[PDB]
Symmetry: C2
Subunit: 79 residues, 2 copies
């Protein structure tokens, strides 16, 4: 059995439990609001600075809807 895989998974679960859950989705969407300043009053072309997070948040939400619904369990519950 892949016990090293278990150790890595358990450590990842503890990292996602001790943090990233008290704030939840609080600071991740804050970067859009912060970078909107450079979008508005900075350079006309700014897509290269906001090309990944825009759909990263959407894919993170569509992956975490399992963790928030009656679906794939939360990290704390699995741990």
């Amino acid at each position: 059995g892949r016990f090293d895989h278990f150790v890595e998974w358990y450590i990842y679960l503890h990292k996602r439990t001790v943090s990233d859950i008290s704030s939840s989705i609080k600071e991740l969407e804050q970067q859009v609001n912060d970078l909107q300043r450079t979008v508005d009053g900075g350079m006309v072309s700014v897509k290269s600075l906001l090309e990944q997070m825009k759909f990263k948040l959407s894919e993170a939400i569509e992956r975490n809807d399992a963790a928030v619904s009656s679906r794939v369990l939360t990290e704390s519950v699995q741990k």
Copy 2:
């Protein structure tokens, strides 16, 4: 002889010839000039997690002095 090493080195030279450092350091300096002016008032959150590229600017300054001080040939000349 390591022909695979030659192929990697040759492709690297081709990329450095079609990219060069004259059109990469200036863009990094422009990004720094824009970001620093944007964060001039404060709210340095958009510079704390973007400090990585500001340090990679100096990292690009590194590994570059060796290319002019050691009298090494230009990538296009070597190719």
